[PDB]
Design a protein around this nucleic acid. Structure first.
Lengths: 292, 284
RNA sequence: GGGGGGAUGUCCGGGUCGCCCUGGGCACCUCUCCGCGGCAGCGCAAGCCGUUUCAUACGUCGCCGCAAUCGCGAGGGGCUCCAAGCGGUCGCCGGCGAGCACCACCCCAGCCCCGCGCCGCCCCCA
């Protein structure tokens, strides 16, 4: 019933762009228990549930074409590389697992590296550049890697959980910038933009009260859309600040997806109120819309 | 509307009957200065002196000072309607429905922007910038300008096109001012809490419990003490990070390397001393 | 909507009974002020309308004692009675002890919650 993943086909004629949702039954639905899904373009979508299988999905057949799997354990994130292709998929055991998307086949290619602590469960990824990766962790750390060599760049460690109870900052969502910096949407409500050349933080914007589960940037690097375990989304503008926050949603917001083409620059959010809800990017322009 | 002195130790308060100056360091009132009603504003004179400027509800321009009682005799009535708003610069300008200086909706207030001048006019939802939500109050900082508008609700829009909502207050805001170096946005409210907006890393930290009184706050001439006007007929000079009222008003070379210059080839068969001297001076 | 009144369109008492009228009941529709408040000029005039954001800080904590006061109630007896006990509040010109740190790094277990597979038992055919 609930949303767990949204993705647009492109993000930039009659070019077939489509919208791919993942419904918490296990379903997938496309507009004009699954846990993640991406597209690939150079266009086919890949999804994971909680099990270790990462599966393609043929659309005109509407059947699970070309399953893939592996040894390690539960995939909790994956993503595709940009151009100057593979997949990177981080799991519970601290492995990050590269899958090959050589021309048509989805192969279990290679496990590059893994954290020494088994108690570091990865949560999300985003790609700072072509060949180097940003991954959140179940501890306070988010961490960079290189896939040319597999190596482990600087741990970008967040603090403790000050507000009460737990110790660990569980980083639920990580995204990137065209500027070269990376936003980390952690637990405890906060967001923080980390610098990209030196991999340290530069700003720690506290807006939400409960953990930001998802966020997404504009395609020009201008507006940042966060969405939390509260009923709350919030926008950010230029180093940065927030503008406002309206409870568009009714449960926690669980998945964002932005699009900036065809004269229709919209960002679509979904959570656990079973109601996908679409926003413009020009947030002072006009109202919003929702679809069920 | 309360105002400090150029040398910080004097506070300045207008009442509904007179003008009273105060010692920020030691005690209560210094001068009962006569100011009849047979009140719009009071600021300081800008360029050379620090006398005063008081405007009453109709045109009677008091140019009056402390350090004396001089100025109790000379008003001015060059304007015909009852005066609404008042601002000085350096050069006086008065809002009457429009300006007179030296338009659709009802006027609210009018403020002046420093030496390379600009004007900021204030109707309900209009605001007029002049180069050369329903409003309640607003402040400003230059250097090229930034305007923080409060509201009849608890939304504090910030402008540098798009505002920023800084909504906290569970009623109208009564006071919004920029702090010092512009890092914080010190705001007040009806509900006795003096909120410090962080405006950096977007946190809030405040002074909650007080005499049910917050309206018309002012900031020190330095980054120091904020003075609060207070609706229980009280002012309160609070120094900063105390949040405690200060005023209530109611050649080193090891020898072994030169030994190593002279160890091998004992006296004869040693290199010639031009070369040995180049070894020694090259060591030094 | 106060009264608005169109045999509008309605039944029940009333006339042998034709359209109908006669007392009680209301659904539809257009006016003076308001029953109530929202918009445009000067202490006050003239004309319009309807029955989503958001909540209140730091400053230092632990144990024990006194004094006023208040509560519960095992256990026993017919909503009441007694009592072992045990806590809260206001004053402590009560005293004692310690302040990162109830934290960081790691390892071994345990409470709880969650996964998956064996047994222990009860089944039904057989």
């Amino acid at each position: 019933s609930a949303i767990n993943a949204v993705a647009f086909t492109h993000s930039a004629k009659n070019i077939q762009v489509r919208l791919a949702i993942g419904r918490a039954n296990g379903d997938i639905e496309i507009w004009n228990s699954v846990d993640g899904l991406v597209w690939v373009t150079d266009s086919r979508l890949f999804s994971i549930g909680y099990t270790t299988t990462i599966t393609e999905w043929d659309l005109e057949k509407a059947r699970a074409k070309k399953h893939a799997s592996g040894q390690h354990g539960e995939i909790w994130c994956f993503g595709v590389q940009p151009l100057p292709r593979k997949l990177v998929a981080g799991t519970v055991d601290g492995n990050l697992v590269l899958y090959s998307i050589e021309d048509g086949d989805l192969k279990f290619q290679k496990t590059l590296t893994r954290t020494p602590s088994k108690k570091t469960k990865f949560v999300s990824i985003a790609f700072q550049s072509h060949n180097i990766v940003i991954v959140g962790c179940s501890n306070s750390t988010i961490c960079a890697y290189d896939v040319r060599t597999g190596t482990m760049l600087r741990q970008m460690t967040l603090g403790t959980d000050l507000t009460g109870g737990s110790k660990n900052i569980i980083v639920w969502a990580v995204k990137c910038l065209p500027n070269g910096d990376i936003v980390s949407g952690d637990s405890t409500g906060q967001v923080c933009i980390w610098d990209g050349k030196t991999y340290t933080q530069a700003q720690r914007i506290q807006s939400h009260t409960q953990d930001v589960l998802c966020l997404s940037v504009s395609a020009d690097g201008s507006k940042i859309i966060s969405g939390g375990m509260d009923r709350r989304t919030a926008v950010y503008e230029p180093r940065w600040s927030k503008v406002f926050h309206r409870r568009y949603h009714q449960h926690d917001v669980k998945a964002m997806a932005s699009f900036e083409g065809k004269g229709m620059s919209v960002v679509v959010s979904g959570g656990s109120d079973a109601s996908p809800i679409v926003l413009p990017l020009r947030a002072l322009g006009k109202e919003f819309h929702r679809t069920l | 509307d309360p105002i400090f002195s150029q040398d910080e130790r004097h506070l300045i308060i207008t009442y509904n009957t007179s003008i009273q100056v105060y010692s920020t360091e030691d005690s209560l009132l210094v001068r009962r200065i006569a100011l009849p009603l047979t009140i719009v504003s009071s600021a300081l004179s800008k360029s050379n002196p620090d006398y005063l400027w008081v405007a009453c509800s109709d045109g009677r321009i008091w140019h009056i000072n402390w350090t004396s009682g001089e100025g109790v005799d000379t008003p001015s009535t060059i304007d015909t309607k009852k005066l609404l708003d008042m601002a000085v610069d350096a050069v006086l300008l008065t809002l009457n429905a429009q300006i007179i200086a030296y338009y659709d909706e009802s006027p609210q207030s009018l403020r002046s922007v420093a030496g390379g001048r600009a004007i900021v006019a204030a109707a309900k939802e209009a605001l007029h910038i002049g180069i050369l939500d329903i409003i309640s109050t607003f402040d400003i900082r230059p250097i090229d300008i930034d305007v923080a508008v409060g509201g009849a609700r608890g939304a504090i829009y910030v402008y540098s096109i798009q505002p920023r909502k800084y909504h906290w207050h569970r009623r109208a805001v009564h006071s919004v001012k920029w702090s010092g170096d512009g890092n914080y946005l010190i705001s007040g409210g009806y509900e006795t809490v003096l909120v410090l907006w962080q405006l950096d890393t977007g946190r809030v930290d405040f002074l909650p419990h007080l005499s049910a009184a917050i309206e018309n706050i002012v900031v020190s001439p330095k980054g120091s003490a904020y003075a609060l006007h207070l609706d229980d007929n009280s002012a309160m000079v609070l120094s900063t990070a105390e949040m405690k009222p200060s005023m209530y008003v109611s050649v080193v070379v090891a020898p072994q390397r030169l030994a190593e210059i002279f160890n091998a080839a004992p006296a004869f068969a040693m290199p010639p001393i031009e070369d040995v001297f180049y070894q020694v001076a090259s060591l030094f």
